[PDB]
Protein backbone atom coordinates (compact mmCIF):
# COMPACT_ATOMS: atom_id res chain seq x y z
CA UNK A 1 0.00 0.00 0.00
CA UNK A 2 0.89 3.66 -0.57
CA UNK A 3 -0.41 4.77 2.84
CA UNK A 4 -2.58 7.92 2.80
CA UNK A 5 -4.22 7.57 6.25
CA UNK A 6 -3.20 5.88 9.47
CA UNK A 7 -6.66 4.81 10.60
CA UNK A 8 -7.14 1.34 12.15
CA UNK A 9 -9.62 -1.16 10.78
CA UNK A 10 -12.56 -2.28 12.93
CA UNK A 11 -14.48 -5.51 12.22
CA UNK A 12 -18.21 -5.65 13.01
CA UNK A 13 -20.39 -8.79 12.84
CA UNK A 14 -24.09 -9.20 11.92
CA UNK A 15 -26.95 -10.97 13.66
CA UNK A 16 -24.50 -13.68 14.63
CA UNK A 17 -21.09 -12.79 16.00
CA UNK A 18 -19.00 -12.92 19.17
CA UNK A 19 -15.74 -11.63 20.62
CA UNK A 20 -12.31 -13.15 20.11
CA UNK A 21 -12.36 -14.84 23.55
CA UNK A 22 -15.80 -16.35 22.87
CA UNK A 23 -16.71 -19.63 21.13
CA UNK A 24 -13.48 -21.10 22.57
CA UNK A 25 -11.55 -18.90 20.11
CA UNK A 26 -13.28 -19.96 16.89
CA UNK A 27 -13.30 -16.60 15.10
CA UNK A 28 -16.42 -15.16 13.46
CA UNK A 29 -14.06 -13.23 11.17
CA UNK A 30 -12.28 -16.14 9.53
CA UNK A 31 -14.11 -19.19 10.81
CA UNK A 32 -12.72 -22.47 9.51
CA UNK A 33 -10.28 -20.55 7.27
CA UNK A 34 -8.31 -18.78 10.02
CA UNK A 35 -8.21 -15.38 11.74
CA UNK A 36 -8.86 -12.39 9.47
CA UNK A 37 -7.90 -9.84 12.15
CA UNK A 38 -4.59 -11.64 12.65
CA UNK A 39 -3.96 -11.73 8.89
CA UNK A 40 -4.50 -7.99 8.59
CA UNK A 41 -2.30 -7.20 11.60
CA UNK A 42 0.44 -9.55 10.40
CA UNK A 43 0.40 -7.70 7.08
CA UNK A 44 0.76 -4.27 8.71
CA UNK A 45 -2.91 -3.16 8.74
CA UNK A 46 -3.77 -2.45 12.37
CA UNK A 47 -7.13 -4.15 13.02
CA UNK A 48 -9.51 -4.57 15.98
CA UNK A 49 -12.76 -6.50 16.47
CA UNK A 50 -16.07 -5.25 17.91
CA UNK A 51 -18.56 -7.58 19.58
CA UNK A 52 -22.10 -6.29 20.18
CA UNK A 53 -25.49 -7.87 20.78
CA UNK A 54 -26.24 -10.10 17.78
CA UNK A 55 -30.04 -9.93 18.19
CA UNK A 56 -30.30 -6.37 19.51
CA UNK A 57 -31.51 -3.41 17.48
CA UNK A 58 -29.06 -1.48 15.33
CA UNK A 59 -29.62 1.43 17.71
CA UNK A 60 -28.52 -0.59 20.74
CA UNK A 61 -25.60 -2.05 18.80
CA UNK A 62 -24.48 1.42 17.71
CA UNK A 63 -24.50 2.61 21.34
CA UNK A 64 -22.54 -0.48 22.35
CA UNK A 65 -20.07 0.05 19.51
CA UNK A 66 -19.52 3.66 20.59
CA UNK A 67 -18.76 2.80 24.22
CA UNK A 68 -16.55 -0.11 23.15
CA UNK A 69 -14.52 2.18 20.88
CA UNK A 70 -14.01 5.30 23.04
CA UNK A 71 -14.49 3.64 26.44
CA UNK A 72 -17.15 3.83 29.14
CA UNK A 73 -20.61 2.56 30.03
CA UNK A 74 -23.03 1.81 27.19
CA UNK A 75 -25.73 4.49 27.21
CA UNK A 76 -28.81 3.63 25.15
CA UNK A 77 -30.41 7.03 25.76
CA UNK A 78 -32.98 7.87 28.43
CA UNK A 79 -35.81 8.41 25.94
CA UNK A 80 -35.14 5.28 23.91
CA UNK A 81 -34.82 3.14 27.02
CA UNK A 82 -38.06 4.44 28.53
CA UNK A 83 -39.92 4.09 25.22
CA UNK A 84 -39.08 0.39 24.74
CA UNK A 85 -38.81 -0.74 28.37
CA UNK A 86 -35.19 -1.76 28.76
CA UNK A 87 -32.27 -0.50 30.79
CA UNK A 88 -30.71 2.85 29.92
CA UNK A 89 -27.21 1.61 30.81
CA UNK A 90 -25.46 -1.47 29.40
CA UNK A 91 -22.06 -2.90 30.21
CA UNK A 92 -18.83 -0.95 30.72
CA UNK A 93 -15.87 -1.11 28.34
CA UNK A 94 -12.25 0.04 28.80
CA UNK A 95 -12.19 1.38 25.24
CA UNK A 96 -10.24 0.07 22.26
CA UNK A 97 -9.28 3.48 20.81
CA UNK A 98 -9.73 6.39 23.25
CA UNK A 99 -7.77 8.57 20.76
CA UNK A 100 -11.01 8.75 18.78
CA UNK A 101 -11.91 11.46 21.29
CA UNK A 102 -8.90 13.52 20.23
CA UNK A 103 -8.87 13.16 16.42
CA UNK A 104 -8.18 9.52 15.55
CA UNK A 105 -10.38 7.87 12.94
CA UNK A 106 -11.28 4.34 11.85
CA UNK A 107 -12.38 2.21 8.92
CA UNK A 108 -15.31 -0.06 9.76
CA UNK A 109 -15.58 -3.33 7.83
CA UNK A 110 -18.98 -4.81 8.58
CA UNK A 111 -20.71 -8.06 7.60
CA UNK A 112 -24.46 -8.66 7.20
CA UNK A 113 -26.48 -6.47 9.63
CA UNK A 114 -23.20 -4.99 10.90
CA UNK A 115 -23.50 -2.73 7.85
CA UNK A 116 -26.71 -1.17 9.15
CA UNK A 117 -25.09 -0.70 12.56
CA UNK A 118 -22.02 1.02 11.12
CA UNK A 119 -24.20 3.34 9.00
CA UNK A 120 -26.28 4.20 12.08
CA UNK A 121 -23.24 4.89 14.28
CA UNK A 122 -21.99 7.41 11.71
CA UNK A 123 -25.44 9.04 11.54
CA UNK A 124 -25.60 9.36 15.33
CA UNK A 125 -22.04 10.69 15.55
CA UNK A 126 -22.77 13.37 12.91
CA UNK A 127 -26.28 14.44 13.93
CA UNK A 128 -26.89 12.99 17.39
CA UNK A 129 -30.51 12.42 18.36
CA UNK A 130 -32.91 15.36 18.54
CA UNK A 131 -35.26 13.22 20.62
CA UNK A 132 -32.58 12.31 23.17
CA UNK A 133 -31.37 15.92 23.41
CA UNK A 134 -34.91 17.13 24.08
CA UNK A 135 -35.71 14.37 26.58
CA UNK A 136 -32.57 15.09 28.59
CA UNK A 137 -33.59 18.75 28.94
CA UNK A 138 -37.20 17.91 29.81
CA UNK A 139 -36.40 15.26 32.45
CA UNK A 140 -33.12 16.73 33.80
CA UNK A 141 -30.96 13.67 33.10
CA UNK A 142 -27.51 13.39 31.56
CA UNK A 143 -27.00 12.93 27.81
CA UNK A 144 -24.47 10.71 26.07
CA UNK A 145 -22.09 12.76 23.88
CA UNK A 146 -23.12 10.33 21.13
CA UNK A 147 -26.52 12.06 20.95
CA UNK A 148 -25.15 15.63 20.98
CA UNK A 149 -24.14 15.56 17.32
CA UNK A 150 -21.19 17.28 15.73
CA UNK A 151 -18.83 14.34 16.27
CA UNK A 152 -16.90 12.52 13.59
CA UNK A 153 -14.46 9.65 13.64
CA UNK A 154 -15.44 7.08 10.96
CA UNK A 155 -13.39 7.62 7.81
CA UNK A 156 -14.97 4.74 5.90
CA UNK A 157 -17.76 2.15 6.19
CA UNK A 158 -17.37 -1.05 4.13
CA UNK A 159 -20.35 -3.41 4.09
CA UNK A 160 -20.29 -7.06 3.00
CA UNK A 161 -23.52 -9.00 2.27
CA UNK A 162 -25.46 -6.34 4.21
CA UNK A 163 -29.28 -6.25 3.90
CA UNK A 164 -29.55 -2.48 3.42
CA UNK A 165 -33.10 -2.97 2.12
CA UNK A 166 -33.74 -5.94 4.38
CA UNK A 167 -34.02 -9.59 3.48
CA UNK A 168 -37.21 -11.37 2.51
CA UNK A 169 -36.04 -14.29 4.65
CA UNK A 170 -37.89 -12.61 7.55
CA UNK A 171 -41.18 -13.25 5.71
CA UNK A 172 -40.64 -17.01 5.58
CA UNK A 173 -43.15 -19.09 7.48
CA UNK A 174 -41.66 -20.30 10.76
CA UNK A 175 -38.85 -17.74 10.37
CA UNK A 176 -38.60 -17.63 14.16
CA UNK A 177 -37.75 -21.33 14.42
CA UNK A 178 -35.51 -21.34 11.33
CA UNK A 179 -33.58 -18.24 12.46
CA UNK A 180 -32.59 -19.89 15.75
CA UNK A 181 -31.81 -23.04 13.77
CA UNK A 182 -29.38 -20.78 11.90
CA UNK A 183 -27.84 -19.78 15.25
CA UNK A 184 -27.42 -23.46 16.15
CA UNK A 185 -25.86 -24.17 12.76
CA UNK A 186 -23.27 -21.46 13.31
CA UNK A 187 -22.59 -22.88 16.79
CA UNK A 188 -22.07 -26.28 15.14
CA UNK A 189 -19.68 -24.73 12.62
CA UNK A 190 -17.77 -23.59 15.73
CA UNK A 191 -17.95 -27.18 17.08
CA UNK A 192 -20.31 -26.07 19.89
CA UNK A 193 -23.29 -28.21 20.83
CA UNK A 194 -26.73 -26.71 21.37
CA UNK A 195 -27.94 -29.31 23.92
CA UNK A 196 -25.15 -28.86 26.51
CA UNK A 197 -25.45 -26.49 29.53
CA UNK A 198 -21.94 -25.01 29.42
CA UNK A 199 -20.95 -23.27 32.65
CA UNK A 200 -18.86 -20.67 30.82
CA UNK A 201 -20.84 -18.26 28.63
CA UNK A 202 -19.34 -19.41 25.27
CA UNK A 203 -21.70 -17.20 23.23
CA UNK A 204 -22.79 -14.10 25.17
CA UNK A 205 -25.81 -12.48 23.53
CA UNK A 206 -25.08 -9.31 25.56
CA UNK A 207 -28.72 -8.78 26.51
CA UNK A 208 -27.96 -6.86 29.70
CA UNK A 209 -30.42 -4.12 28.80
CA UNK A 210 -33.21 -6.69 28.56
CA UNK A 211 -32.07 -8.52 31.69
CA UNK A 212 -31.60 -11.77 29.73
CA UNK A 213 -28.75 -14.24 30.20
CA UNK A 214 -28.30 -17.98 29.70
CA UNK A 215 -28.79 -19.48 33.16
CA UNK A 216 -26.64 -22.02 35.04
CA UNK A 217 -27.62 -25.46 33.80
CA UNK A 218 -29.31 -24.06 30.67
CA UNK A 219 -28.49 -25.27 27.16
CA UNK A 220 -28.56 -23.07 24.07
CA UNK A 221 -31.56 -25.12 22.93
CA UNK A 222 -33.45 -24.15 26.08
CA UNK A 223 -32.11 -20.57 26.06
CA UNK A 224 -33.20 -19.93 22.47
CA UNK A 225 -36.72 -21.14 23.29
CA UNK A 226 -36.76 -18.38 25.91
CA UNK A 227 -35.21 -15.83 23.56
CA UNK A 228 -37.92 -16.56 20.97
CA UNK A 229 -40.55 -15.44 23.49
CA UNK A 230 -38.50 -12.49 24.87
CA UNK A 231 -38.63 -8.76 23.99
CA UNK A 232 -35.42 -9.10 21.92
CA UNK A 233 -37.44 -11.21 19.48
CA UNK A 234 -40.95 -9.71 19.85
CA UNK A 235 -40.35 -5.93 20.12
CA UNK A 236 -39.67 -3.45 17.34
CA UNK A 237 -36.38 -2.61 19.11
CA UNK A 238 -34.67 -5.67 17.63
CA UNK A 239 -32.41 -6.94 14.87
CA UNK A 240 -35.38 -8.98 13.62
CA UNK A 241 -37.41 -5.84 12.89
CA UNK A 242 -34.47 -3.93 11.37
CA UNK A 243 -33.77 -7.00 9.20
CA UNK A 244 -37.23 -6.96 7.63
CA UNK A 245 -37.88 -5.12 4.37
CA UNK A 246 -40.25 -2.79 6.24
CA UNK A 247 -37.91 -2.18 9.15
CA UNK A 248 -34.89 -1.60 6.92
CA UNK A 249 -36.80 1.03 4.93
CA UNK A 250 -37.71 2.78 8.18
CA UNK A 251 -34.03 2.74 9.17
CA UNK A 252 -33.08 4.11 5.73
CA UNK A 253 -35.44 7.06 6.22
CA UNK A 254 -33.14 8.56 8.87
CA UNK A 255 -29.74 6.81 8.53
CA UNK A 256 -28.11 8.55 5.57
CA UNK A 257 -24.62 8.83 4.13
CA UNK A 258 -22.30 11.41 5.69
CA UNK A 259 -20.31 13.59 3.25
CA UNK A 260 -17.25 13.01 5.52
CA UNK A 261 -17.21 9.22 5.08
CA UNK A 262 -16.38 6.80 2.28
CA UNK A 263 -18.89 3.99 1.84
CA UNK A 264 -17.96 0.75 0.09
CA UNK A 265 -20.39 -2.12 -0.50
CA UNK A 266 -19.59 -5.72 -1.45
CA UNK A 267 -22.39 -7.93 -2.75
CA UNK A 268 -22.65 -11.72 -2.62
CA UNK A 269 -24.58 -14.24 -4.72
CA UNK A 270 -24.59 -18.03 -4.75
CA UNK A 271 -27.51 -19.06 -6.99
CA UNK A 272 -28.56 -19.97 -10.54
CA UNK A 273 -31.89 -19.49 -12.36
CA UNK A 274 -33.82 -22.54 -13.44
CA UNK A 275 -35.63 -22.90 -16.75
CA UNK A 276 -39.19 -23.29 -15.38
CA UNK A 277 -40.22 -19.83 -14.14
CA UNK A 278 -36.94 -18.00 -13.50
CA UNK A 279 -36.63 -18.85 -9.80
CA UNK A 280 -33.18 -18.96 -8.19
CA UNK A 281 -31.64 -22.07 -6.66
CA UNK A 282 -28.56 -22.63 -4.48
CA UNK A 283 -25.32 -23.51 -6.28
CA UNK A 284 -23.32 -26.54 -5.29
CA UNK A 285 -21.19 -25.80 -2.26
CA UNK A 286 -23.44 -23.24 -0.59
CA UNK A 287 -23.39 -23.83 3.16
CA UNK A 288 -25.74 -26.69 3.97
CA UNK A 289 -28.07 -24.79 6.29
CA UNK A 290 -28.78 -22.04 3.77
CA UNK A 291 -28.99 -24.44 0.82
CA UNK A 292 -31.73 -26.53 2.47
CA UNK A 293 -33.60 -24.14 4.75
CA UNK A 294 -33.32 -20.63 3.29
CA UNK A 295 -32.19 -20.40 -0.34
CA UNK A 296 -35.26 -22.07 -1.93
CA UNK A 297 -37.55 -19.55 -0.24
CA UNK A 298 -35.25 -16.60 -1.00
CA UNK A 299 -35.07 -17.51 -4.67
CA UNK A 300 -38.84 -17.94 -5.11
CA UNK A 301 -40.64 -15.56 -2.70
CA UNK A 302 -42.54 -12.78 -4.49
CA UNK A 303 -44.67 -10.13 -2.73
CA UNK A 304 -46.34 -7.36 -4.78
CA UNK A 305 -47.41 -5.44 -1.65
CA UNK A 306 -43.74 -4.91 -0.75
CA UNK A 307 -42.30 -4.63 -4.29
CA UNK A 308 -40.61 -8.04 -4.05
CA UNK A 309 -40.23 -9.23 -7.67
CA UNK A 310 -37.68 -10.97 -9.91
CA UNK A 311 -34.84 -8.59 -8.98
CA UNK A 312 -35.02 -9.94 -5.41
CA UNK A 313 -34.60 -13.63 -6.24
CA UNK A 314 -30.81 -13.76 -6.54
CA UNK A 315 -29.38 -14.33 -3.04
CA UNK A 316 -26.39 -15.50 -0.99
CA UNK A 317 -28.37 -18.01 1.09
CA UNK A 318 -29.46 -15.40 3.67
CA UNK A 319 -29.84 -12.00 1.99
CA UNK A 320 -31.28 -10.96 -1.37
CA UNK A 321 -28.33 -9.76 -3.43
CA UNK A 322 -30.18 -6.66 -4.66
CA UNK A 323 -30.37 -5.47 -1.04
CA UNK A 324 -26.58 -5.26 -0.64
CA UNK A 325 -25.11 -2.52 -2.85
CA UNK A 326 -26.49 0.23 -0.60
CA UNK A 327 -29.67 1.59 0.99
CA UNK A 328 -32.33 2.25 -1.67
CA UNK A 329 -35.80 1.71 -0.20
CA UNK A 330 -36.65 4.96 1.55
CA UNK A 331 -33.10 6.23 1.00
CA UNK A 332 -31.66 9.30 -0.71
CA UNK A 333 -28.09 7.95 -0.61
CA UNK A 334 -26.34 7.72 -3.98
CA UNK A 335 -24.79 4.47 -5.27
CA UNK A 336 -22.10 4.59 -7.97
CA UNK A 337 -20.32 1.64 -9.60
CA UNK A 338 -16.69 1.62 -8.54
CA UNK A 339 -14.58 3.22 -11.27
CA UNK A 340 -11.05 3.17 -9.83
CA UNK A 341 -11.46 6.17 -7.51
CA UNK A 342 -13.38 5.87 -4.24
CA UNK A 343 -15.72 8.79 -3.52
CA UNK A 344 -16.77 10.28 -0.19
CA UNK A 345 -20.39 10.53 0.86
CA UNK A 346 -21.68 7.96 -1.66
CA UNK A 347 -21.81 4.17 -1.91
CA UNK A 348 -18.96 2.77 -4.00
CA UNK A 349 -20.43 -0.51 -5.31
CA UNK A 350 -17.38 -2.77 -5.45
CA UNK A 351 -19.33 -5.45 -7.32
CA UNK A 352 -20.79 -8.87 -6.66
CA UNK A 353 -18.83 -11.97 -5.61
CA UNK A 354 -19.79 -15.62 -6.08
CA UNK A 355 -19.55 -16.38 -2.36
CA UNK A 356 -22.34 -17.16 0.06
CA UNK A 357 -23.28 -15.38 3.27
CA UNK A 358 -21.13 -17.55 5.56
CA UNK A 359 -18.30 -18.34 3.11
CA UNK A 360 -17.42 -14.65 2.82
CA UNK A 361 -16.31 -14.65 6.48
CA UNK A 362 -14.94 -18.19 6.41
CA UNK A 363 -17.56 -19.73 8.67
CA UNK A 364 -18.29 -22.12 5.79
CA UNK A 365 -15.48 -23.47 3.56
CA UNK A 366 -15.09 -22.50 -0.09
CA UNK A 367 -11.67 -23.47 -1.51
CA UNK A 368 -12.15 -21.52 -4.73
CA UNK A 369 -12.55 -18.30 -2.71
CA UNK A 370 -9.19 -16.76 -1.78
CA UNK A 371 -10.52 -15.18 1.39
CA UNK A 372 -7.08 -14.03 2.53
CA UNK A 373 -6.56 -12.18 -0.75
CA UNK A 374 -10.05 -10.62 -0.60
CA UNK A 375 -9.51 -8.99 2.79
CA UNK A 376 -5.89 -8.00 2.12
CA UNK A 377 -6.92 -6.27 -1.10
CA UNK A 378 -9.71 -4.46 0.78
CA UNK A 379 -7.29 -3.34 3.51
CA UNK A 380 -4.94 -1.94 0.83
CA UNK A 381 -7.80 0.08 -0.66
CA UNK A 382 -8.77 1.51 2.74
CA UNK A 383 -5.11 2.25 3.55
CA UNK A 384 -5.02 4.28 0.30
CA UNK A 385 -8.05 6.47 1.10
CA UNK A 386 -7.52 10.23 1.23
CA UNK A 387 -8.25 11.52 4.79
CA1 LIG B 1 -19.31 -23.60 0.97
CL1 LIG C 1 -32.66 -14.49 32.03
NA1 LIG D 1 -26.03 -12.69 9.24
ZN1 LIG E 1 -33.01 -0.48 22.56
Domain boundaries, the chain: 9-384
If you measure from the C-alpha of residue 213 to the centroid of ligand 2, how many angstroms do you get, rounded to a whole number?
A: 4
Structural determination approach: X-ray
User: Which ligand has the minimum distance to the alpha carbon of residue 17?
Assistant: 3
364 is in an annotated binding site: yes
Give the active site residues. Answer: 112, 316, 357
User: Which ligand has the minimum distance to the alpha carbon of residue 14?
Assistant: 3
Can you identify the CATH homologous superfamily of domain 9-384? Alpha/Beta hydrolase fold, catalytic domain (3.40.50.1820)
86 is in an annotated binding site: yes
Among candidates 308, 310, 371, 385, which has minimal Cα distance to 343?
A: 385
Burial 359-386 (b: 16+ CB within 10 A, else e): bbbbbbebeebebbebbbebbebbbebe
Cα–Cα dist 79/95, whole Å = 25
387 is in an annotated binding site: no
Cα–Cα dist 242/253, whole Å = 12
CB 261 within 8 A of CB 154: yes
Cα→Cα distances 94→28, 41, 98, 200, Å: 22, 21, 9, 22
If you measure from the C-alpha of residue 91 to the centroid of ligand 1, how many angstroms do you get, rounded to a whole number?
A: 36
SS3 237: coil
Resolution, given in Å to one decimal, reads 2.0
Burial of 71 (0-12, 13-18, 19+ CB in 10 A): middle
Cα–Cα dist 22/28, whole Å = 10
Long-range contact pairs involving 72-77 (C-beta distance under 8 Å, separation at least 24)? 74/208, 74/209, 75/144, 75/146, 76/209, 77/129, 77/131, 77/132, 77/135, 77/144, 77/147
If you measure from the C-alpha of residue 164 to the centroid of ligand 3, how many angstroms do you get, rounded to a whole number?
A: 12
If you measure from the C-alpha of residue 287 to the centroid of ligand 1, how many angstroms do you get, rounded to a whole number?
A: 5
365 is in an annotated binding site: yes
Amino acid sequence: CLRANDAPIVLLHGFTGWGREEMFGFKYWGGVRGDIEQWLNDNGYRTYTLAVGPLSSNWDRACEAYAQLVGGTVDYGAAHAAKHGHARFGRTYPGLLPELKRGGRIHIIAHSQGGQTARMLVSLLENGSQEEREYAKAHNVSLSPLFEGGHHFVLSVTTIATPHDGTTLVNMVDFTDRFFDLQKAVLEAAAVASNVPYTSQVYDFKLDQWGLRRQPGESFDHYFERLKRSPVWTSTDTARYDLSVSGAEKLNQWVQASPNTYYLSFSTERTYRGALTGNHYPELGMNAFSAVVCAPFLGSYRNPTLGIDDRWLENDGIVNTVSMNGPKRGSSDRIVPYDGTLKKGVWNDMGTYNVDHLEIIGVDPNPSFDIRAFYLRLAEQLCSLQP
